[model samples]
Target: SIKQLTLYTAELDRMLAFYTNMLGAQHVHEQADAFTIQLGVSQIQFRAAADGTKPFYHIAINIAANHFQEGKAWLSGFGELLTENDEDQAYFPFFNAYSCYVEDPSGNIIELISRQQAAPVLDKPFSADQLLSIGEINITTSDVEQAATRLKQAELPVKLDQIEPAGLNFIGDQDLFLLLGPPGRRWLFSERVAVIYPLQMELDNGVSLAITETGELVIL
Candidate 1:
C-alpha cells in the first residue's frame, strides 16, 4: 500500500546519472531543482540539496528472483562490491536471499538483493539484471525521540518495535521498516557507515515521507 518516495541528494548530477544510466531507472520528469525516476510501482525523485553537508540516506532496491543473478553481474562493472552476505540463513531468517553492497557515484550505498532463491556465490562467475523495487529507506539522525515525535505528529504511526541499547529506533508501517540511529552507526545491510541527515522517502504507492531537519518523519 506504500507509494512513491523521494530523497534529497547532495550530488544531483551523479545521483541522476547513477539512477538513470547505471540502474536503468526511467526518467519521468525533470526540473531545475528536481527529477523523478520510475521504479516499478513507485517513483524516486532526486532534488538538489540546499545544504551539501547533510548526508543522503541509502535506498534499497529489490529485484525479481529470476533476474537476481544477472543484475548482480551488471552492477559489478559500475562499482566495486563493498560487502556481500551469502550465508544461506543470515538476516531474514525465513527467506533464502543474498545481498551485495555497492556505492553510487555520490558514495550513497545502493543494495541489490536477490531473494527467495539461491544467489550465486562470490567464487562463481555470475551476473544479475533483476533489480526491481525500492525495498526500504534508512534514516540517520541525532535524536530518536524528537524524530519519533515528528513522525507521530505527521500521522506516520511510529511504533517502537525494536530498540537497541545503543540507541537505534526501528520504525515504519506494517510492510516497511526504517532504521533510525544517532548520526554515526551505519544502516543495516550496508557497507559504508555514515549518519543520515534530512531523510525522506516517497514510495510508488504515493505514500510520501518528509523527514525534518530534526530527524522526524512527516508522512504526507
Candidate 2:
C-alpha cells in the first residue's frame, strides 16, 4: 500500500550509512542535503531538517514470511532487540506475523515484521537486500477515532479486525499499514519520542497524503 515516506533527518551522513551500509537499501537517488533509499517497492527519502529538529518516527519494514527466523538472526547482528512487556519478540496470532524492533541512527523505532501476505519470500538467508518493503508508518493525531473515521469515510479500507483503542490501529493490510496511534506514545525501543512530522507519501494505488507541518493531513 505504501510507495514512499519522507522523513526529516538531523544527521544526514549518519542516516545515509544506517540505510545504505547497515540496512542494505539501494541508493536510488542522492543530492546535497538529501537522498533516497529503495526498499523493495518502498522509497525512504531523508531530507536535512532545516531548523535542526530531529524528527523521529516509528517505521515498519516487511521481511520474507518464510524467513522470519533467518531475518531475526540477521538483524540481531547489528543492534539490540526491542521488546514489549517482557517479550523480546512479538507474535501477532491474528495477523500470523512476527516482529522485532530496533533503533536507527536517529533513535527512530524500526520494526522488521514478517506477514504471510507480504511479498518477496526467498529461499536464501536474510539480508538487507531481501527487505520486502516499508510496510507501516505510525501516524499520530490528537483524536485517534476521528482520524480513522476520515479514512473509512474516504472509502479506503480500515483493518477493523485489528484495531485497538489508545494504541495501534492498522488502516490497511500487512503489505501497507497506516498505523494510527495517540500522541505521547514513545517510539518503541528508544528514549526518543514519536511525533508527527511533515510526512509526504504516495500509495501504490496512486493515493497521496501530505502531512503538513501544522499537522493537517491533506489527501491529495
Candidate 3:
C-alpha cells in the first residue's frame, strides 16, 4: 500500500548510482542534497545524511508473481542473496508469497517479493517497472506494543495472519506491512546490530506515517 518513502543515506553518490545507474530507477525529483526515484507507483526519496552516520532501513519491493525466478536472478546480480534456514529463497505458505533479499548501497535490506496467492503475475524479466510497489518497511520503535497501538489508532490494523510482538509485529495487510519492532531487536540480515532508522511513508489509502529519528511512530 505504500506509495512513497523518504530514507537517509550518508553516501549520496553511491546511493544514486545504485538506484539510477545500477537498478535502472529514474530520478523524478532532484535537488542538491536529495532526490526521489520513481519505483512504479512509489517514490523513494533519498536524502543526504551527515558524515560518519549510517542511516538505513529495511525495504521490501513487490515483483510479479509469475517470474520470481527471473526476478531473483536480477537481484542476485546486484547483491548477494541472504537466505534463511527455510526455503532456498523465502517462501511463506501462509501468505502464498515468495521473496528474495539483497543489501543495498545504503545498507538497507532490500526484499523483492511475489504474492502468488493474490496479485497478477508478469512474464517479463526484473526491472524497475516490474517492481510493483513497496510492501514492507521496518519501524523499529521504543516499544513494540506501544508502536503497534499507535498504528492501530491510525487505522492500520495488526495482521491476523501472523505475529511476533516481542520482536516484531506486522501491521496492515498482505499488500503493505509495517514491521513494527522495539529496540535491541536486530533486523534480519542487518549484521545483528540494533537499529533506530527514521523514515516517512505515504500509503495507498492516503495515510502518511513517520518513524522518527529516535524511533517513534506517528501518523502524519
Candidate 4:
C-alpha cells in the first residue's frame, strides 16, 4: 500500500482549504512551504512548487462500498463532480466498483472509489475518516512500457499480464495501484489529460519512487 505521497502545487492556500474544509481531511503537519493531511491510512504532503509550474496529479481515494450515495452528497455540496456522458458516477463491472471524479483548486483529479467486494459497508455516516486508503496514483509518462518496466524492476507487480501502450496499466496489488499511462490520454470521467509532473511516493516496504518534472523516473 502507499504510505506517503508528495505533490507540488502553486495554489497552496486553495489546495489546503479544499482538502481540509471540503474533503474534511485532517491537517497532520505544516511548514512554511508544505503541509500534510491524513486521508484514512495514507498521508499526502503538498509542497509549494519550486518552479512556476502548476502541476496536477490523478489520485484515487477509497470509500466504503455501501456509502457511495452519502459520499456523493457530501462531495456534491462542495463542488461540481466531473461527468461523462452527463453521468457523474460510474459503476465498473470489471473491477466491481463505483467511482466519481472531482477536481481540486490545482486541477488534481481526485477520484472517490468504492470496491464492492474489497471494502465492506459501514454502519455510521460517511466522512473523510471513512476513507479507506489511497487506492491509485497516476504516473503519467511519455513511454508507458519503459516506465512500467522501471516499476517492475522495483518489485512492483503489474496487475495485468499484458502491457498496453495506449491503455491504463495497473501496477501494484489489488487494493492499491500506480496507474501507469502515456501522457495526453484523457481520464475516464473527466476532460483532464494525463500530464507528467514531479511526484514522490513511498511504499510500505521502504521503497521509494520519484518522477522529475522532465518525465525522468527515479527509484530508490
Candidate 5:
C-alpha cells in the first residue's frame, strides 16, 4: 500500500500545471523547486531535477469501477490516450479492470485503472476525488531478482509465487503494487523504455523504499 511517493522532474513548471490545473489534484506543499499534491489517499511530490537528469515514471491511479468510459472522456479533453495496437484502452480479465494510459508533461506514463472487483460504482461523473489511490509504481532496476529480494526482505512480499528474473514482477497486493523489473523493457501502450531513476516511496505500513541517483536500492 502506497501512502506517499516522490518523483523528479526536469520540467517543473509544466509538470505542476498538468497535475494542479489539468488533473485537478490539490496542492499539499510547494517550494521554489518542488511541490506535493494530494491524490486521494496518497501524496506525490515532484522536485526539480538537479544537473541534467531527466526522470519519468509509470504510475497507476485507481478510479470508480463504473467510471471508466466517462473518466476516459474527461481525460481525453486534456490529451490523447495511449493506445496498444489499434485499441485506445485495455481490459484485463484477471484483474477485472479497465485501464487507459496517458503521458504527463514530464513523460511519465500515468495509468487510470478501474478495478471492478475492488472499487464501487459511482453515479457521479469522474473527478479528481474519484482517483482513489496510487495503485502501482514502476521501479526499474539492473537485476530484477536482486531488487526484488531487497524489497521482500523489507517486508514487501512478491505478489507472485517467485521473482521473474527477466519479466515484470509485482510486489505487494491487489490494493497496491510496485512494478519491479529490469530496465529496457518497453512499457505497454507506449514506446518509452523503462529506466532507473531516483524515487522515494512511503508505504502505509511505515516502510520507506528508495532508488538513489546511481540506481542503488535503499530500504529505510
Candidate 6:
C-alpha cells in the first residue's frame, strides 16, 4: 500500500553513504541527477540540489506494527528523540508507534517508525541495518495556494482537507499533506534545514508524482 518518496539534497555522496553503507539499503539505480535506494517494499530517491539553502521536505519509513520496540532501539543509535504537542509520544497520533530522527551525512532527515504488530520488539539495540520501508513523505513550499493551483493544472485531484496554524496543509487521496512555510524551518523529527523545493518519486506500485519546480503535484 505504501510507496516511494524522494528528497533533494546538497550533499549527495554523504546521503548515499549514510543510506547505503550505514543503513544497508540496497542501491537500486543511479543517474547523473538522481539515485535510488530500496528499503523493504519502498524506494527512496535523492537528487542533487543546486541551492543548499533551499529546504526539501521530510520522508517517513514504516515498519511492521510488531517491530515497534525493535525499531525504536535500532533508530535510537542514529537519531535524536522527537517531542511534539506536549505528548512526548514517538512521532504522532499512531498507537503503539515510536519514531526517531536521523540525519544523513548530507543533512537530510530520515524518520524511522515501527508499529506494534509488525514484529517482536527486539531486546537489543539496533542500527540502520534493522530499519525498513519508507512510509510517507512531507513536502513544503512557499505558497500552498499556488502549489494547489499547480497540482490542479497537472491533473492531480488534490483536495485541501485541513489546515493547521502550525503551517501544514493536507492534500491528496490518502491524506498526504504538503506543508507550506517560510524557508529554514526544521520539521519535528529532523534537524536539517527545510527548504522550499520540488522532488519526484516512483513507487513499485506504479504510482508516481512529479513535484514540479514550482511545487506542483503531478500524479503519473
Q: For candidate 4, what is the lDDT?
A: 0.83
lDDT of 3 at 20: 74
For model 3, how does the per-residue alpha-carbon lDDT over 1-220 read when each residue is reduced to its tens digit?
A: 7788988998788877777764564545567999788767777899998677888788888777787888788888887887666444878786688888888887888888788966676655666567777878888886666677667777777653454656776676666777777767565655645588778888888989888888888788
Per-residue lDDT, model 4, residue 107, is: 86
- Where model 2 places Cα greater than 4 Å from the true spot, the runs are 117-121, 159-166
| Better model by lDDT: candidate 4 vs candidate 5 | 5
- Return whichever of 1 and 2 wins on TM-score: 2
Q: Candidate 4 on 1-220: residue-level lDDT in tens?
A: 7889999999988887777786454455667898888877788999998666888898998899899888887777767998999899999886688888888899888888888887778988998678888998998777777777778788788644598988788776677878887788788877678888899989888889888887767886
Per-residue lDDT over 75-184 for candidate 5, one digit per residue giving the tens place of the 0 to 100 score: 78768999999899999786788999889898899888888887788888788777889988998876676677788788777644588877888777676778888788
Least accurate 10 contiguous residues by lDDT in model 1: 120-129
lDDT of 1 by residue, 145-198 (tens): 666766656556576444442566656543345665666665554545756456
Among these predictions, the greatest lDDT belongs to 5
TM-score of 1: 0.72
RMSD of each: 5.3, 2.7, 2.5, 1.8, 1.7, 4.7
- At residue 49, give the lDDT of candidate 3: 83
Task: Report the number of clashing residue pairs per model.
Answer: 24, 0, 0, 0, 0, 15
Give the lDDT of residue 47 in candidate 3.
95
- lDDT string for model 6 (37-72, tens) is 877666667778777344346666766555555565
- TM-score of each model, in listed order: 0.72, 0.86, 0.88, 0.93, 0.93, 0.68
On a 0 to 100 scale, what is the lDDT of residue 161 in model 5? Answer: 55
The lDDT of each candidate is 0.59, 0.75, 0.76, 0.83, 0.83, 0.58
Per lDDT, what order, best first? 5, 4, 3, 2, 1, 6
